[PDB]
Amino acid sequence: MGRRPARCYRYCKNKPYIKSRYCRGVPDAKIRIFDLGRKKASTDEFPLCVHLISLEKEQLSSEAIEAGRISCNKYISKTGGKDSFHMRVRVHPWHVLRINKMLSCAGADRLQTGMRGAFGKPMGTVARVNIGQIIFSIRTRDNMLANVVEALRRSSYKFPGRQKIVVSKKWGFTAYNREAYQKLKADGRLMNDGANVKVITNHGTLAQYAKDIAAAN
Amino acid sequence: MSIFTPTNQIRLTNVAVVRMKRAGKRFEIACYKNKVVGWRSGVEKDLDEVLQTHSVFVNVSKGQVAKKEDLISAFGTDDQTEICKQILTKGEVQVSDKERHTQLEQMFRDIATIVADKCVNPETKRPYTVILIERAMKDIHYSVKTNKSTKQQALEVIKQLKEKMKIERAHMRLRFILPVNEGKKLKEKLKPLIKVIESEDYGQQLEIVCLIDPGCFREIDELIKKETKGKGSLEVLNLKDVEEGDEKFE
Amino acid sequence: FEATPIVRVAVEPKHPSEMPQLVKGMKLLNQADPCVQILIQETGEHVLVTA
Amino acid sequence: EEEYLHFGEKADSENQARKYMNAVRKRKGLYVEEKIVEHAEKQRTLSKNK
Amino acid sequence: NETCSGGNENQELQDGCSEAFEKRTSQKGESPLTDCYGPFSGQLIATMKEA
Amino acid sequence: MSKAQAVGSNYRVSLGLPVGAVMNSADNSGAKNLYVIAVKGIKGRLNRLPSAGVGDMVMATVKKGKPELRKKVCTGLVVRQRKHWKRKDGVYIYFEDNAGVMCNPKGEVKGNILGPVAKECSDLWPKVATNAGTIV
RNA sequence: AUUAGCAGUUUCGGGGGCGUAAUGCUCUCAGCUGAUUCUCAAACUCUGAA
RNA sequence: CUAUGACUCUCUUAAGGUAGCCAAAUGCCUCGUCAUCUAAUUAGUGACGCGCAUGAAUGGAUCAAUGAGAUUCCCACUGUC
RNA sequence: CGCUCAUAGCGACGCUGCUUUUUGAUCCUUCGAUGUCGGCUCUUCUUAUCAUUGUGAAGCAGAAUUCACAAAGUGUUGGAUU
**Cα B31 to Cα A133: distance, rounded to the nearest angstrom:** 42
Tell whether B4 is covered by a domain: no
Distance (Å, rounded) from C-alpha A64 to C-alpha A159? 6
Q: What are phi and psi of B40, to 5 degrees?
A: -80, -10
Q: Residue C28 contacts by C-beta under 8 Å, 6 or more apart in sequence?
A: none
What single-letter amino acid sits at F43? Answer: K
Contact A127, A62 (CB under 8 A): yes
Probe site for chain E from B178, B180, B208 (most E CB atoms < 10 A): B208
Tell if the CB–CB gap between D28 and C45 is shorter than 8 Å.
Answer: no
Nearest 10 degrees: Cα torsion A164, A167, A171, A173 = 0
**How far is residue F55's CA from residue A120's CA, in Å, rounded to a whole number?**
73
SS3 of chain B: the string is: CCCCCCCCCCCCCCCCCCEEEECCEEEECCECHHHHHHHHCCCCCCCCCCECCCCCEEECCCCEECCHHHHHHHHCCCCHHHHHHHHHHHCECCCCCHHHHHHHHHHHHCCCCCCCCCCCCCCCCCCCCHHHHHHHHHHCCCCCCCCCCHHHHHHHHHHHHHHHHHCCCCECCEEEEECCCHHHHHHHHHCCCCEEECCCCCCCCCEEEEEECECCCHHHHHHHHHHHHCCCCEEECCCCCCCCCCCCCC
Residue B18 lies in a domain: yes
CB-based contact D37 E43, cutoff 8 Å: no
Q: CA–CA separation, F83 vs F97, rounded Å?
A: 8
CATH number at residue A77: 3.90.1170.10
Please report, for the domain that includes residue A200, its CATH number: 3.30.60.300
Residues 6+ apart with CB under 8 A from D1: none
Is E17 at the interface with chain B, CB within 8 A?
Answer: yes
User: B35 to chain A nearest CA, in Å?
Assistant: 14
Domain final residue, candidates B107, B132, B166: B166
Total residues belonging to chain E: 51
Ramachandran category for residue B26: left, alpha or beta (phi over 0 → left; psi -120 to 50 → alpha): beta
Q: Following DSSP, what letter does each residue of F61-111 receive, concatenated?
A: EBSSB-TTTBSS-EEEEEEE-SS-EE-TTS-EE--SS-EEEEB-TTS-BSS
Residues A139 and A212 grouped into a single domain: no
Residue A211's domain comprises: 175-217
Is residue A208 located within the same domain as residue A161? Answer: no
Residues A106 and A212 grouped into a single domain = no
Does residue B211 lie in a domain region?
yes
| Listed residue (A36, A41, A7, A48) closest to A165, CA to CA | A48
Probe site for chain C from B121, B125, B132 (most C CB atoms < 10 A) = B132
Contact list, B244 vs chain D (CB under 8 Å): 33, 35
Query: Are residues A87 and A189 located together in one domain of the fold?
Result: no
Same domain, B79 and B135: no
Residues A119, A206 share a domain: no
Number of domains in chain A: 2
Task: Domain count for chain B, please give it.
Answer: 3
| Residues near B197 by beta carbon (within 8 Å), at least 6 away in sequence | B210, B211, B212
Angstrom distance (rounded) from CA B14 to CA B98: 16
Q: Which residues in chain E touch residue D3, judged by CB atoms under 8 angstroms apart?
A: none
Same domain? B220 vs B202: yes
In 3D space, the residue among B241, B110, B248 whose CA is nearest the CA of residue B167 turns out to be B248
* Interface mutation target, options B119, B128, B221, chain D, most CBs of D under 10 Å: B128
Instruction: Answer yes or no: is B119 within a domain.
Output: yes
User: Are both A72 and A127 inside the same structural domain?
Assistant: yes
Rounded to an integer, what distance in angstroms lies between the CA atom of residue F32 and that of residue F23? Answer: 9
Q: Which of B166, B181, B204 is the last residue of a domain?
A: B166
Indicate whether B25 belongs to any domain.
yes
Q: How crowded is the C-beta side of B158, counted as CA atoms within 13 Å?
A: 25
Instruction: Give the residue among B38, B30, B20 at the shortest CA–CA distance from B98.
Output: B38
* A124 in Cβ contact with A45 (< 8 Å): no
Q: How far is B128 from chain E (nearest CA, A)?
A: 19
**Residue B133 and residue B164 in contact, taking contact as beta carbons nearer than 8 Å:** no
Shared domain for A64 and A27, answered yes or no, is yes
Question: Does residue A96 reach within 7 angstroms of strand G, measured from its CB?
Answer: no
Whether B197 is covered by a domain: the verdict is yes
* Interatomic separation, CA of residue A87 and C1' of nucleotide G4, rounded (Å): 10
Contacts of F62 (CB under 8 A, 6+ apart): F25, F31, F32, F33, F34, F35, F69, F70, F71, F72, F74, F102
Q: Are A123 and A93 in contact (CB under 8 A)?
A: no
**Structural domains counted in chain F:** 1
Q: Are B215 and B241 in contact (CB under 8 A)?
A: yes
By residue range, what is the domain housing residue F98?
1-136
Last residue of one domain, picked from the residues B63, B94, B125: B94
In angstroms, the separation between the Cα of residue D12 and the nearest Cα of chain B is 23
Determine the structural domain holding residue B86 and report its residue range: 13-94
Q: Look up residue C29 and give its DSSP letter.
A: H
Same domain assignment for residues B48 and B26: yes
Resolution in angstrom units: 4.2
CATH number at residue F20: 2.40.150.20
Dist CA E34 CA E22 (whole Å): 12
Q: Which of A155, A194, A188, A189 is nearest to A174 (CA)?
A: A194
Cis ω before B126 (30° cut-off from 0): yes
B25, B41, F23 from F101: Cα distances, Å: 68, 58, 9
Is the domain of B26 the same as that of B89?
yes
Same domain membership, residue A163 and residue A205: no
Taking only Cα atoms into account, the Rg of chain E, rounded to an integer number of angstroms, comes to 12
Residue E41 in contact with partner chain B when CB distance is under 8 A? yes
CA distances from B26 to B34, C49, D32, D43, E13 (A): 21, 66, 56, 38, 57
Q: Decide if B198 is inside a domain.
A: yes
Q: What DSSP line would sit under E1-51, residue for residue? A: --SS--SS--SS------HHHHHHS---SS-SS----SS-HHHHHHHHHH-
- For F4 and I63, how far is CA from C1' in angstroms? 19
CA F29 – CA F104 distance, rounded (Å): 12
Yes or no: say if A120 and A154 are a contact pair by the CB < 8 Å rule.
no
Pair (A146, A214) in one structural domain:
no
Cα(A183)–Cα(A169) distance, integer angstroms: 15
Q: How many residues does chain B have?
A: 250
Q: Does residue B157 lie within 7 Å of nucleic acid chain H, judged by its CB?
A: no
> What is d(CA B32, CA A105) in angstroms, rounded to the nearest whole number?
10
- Residues B75-82: contacts with CB within 8 Å, 24+ apart? B75/B22, B80/B54, B80/B55, B80/B56, B81/B47
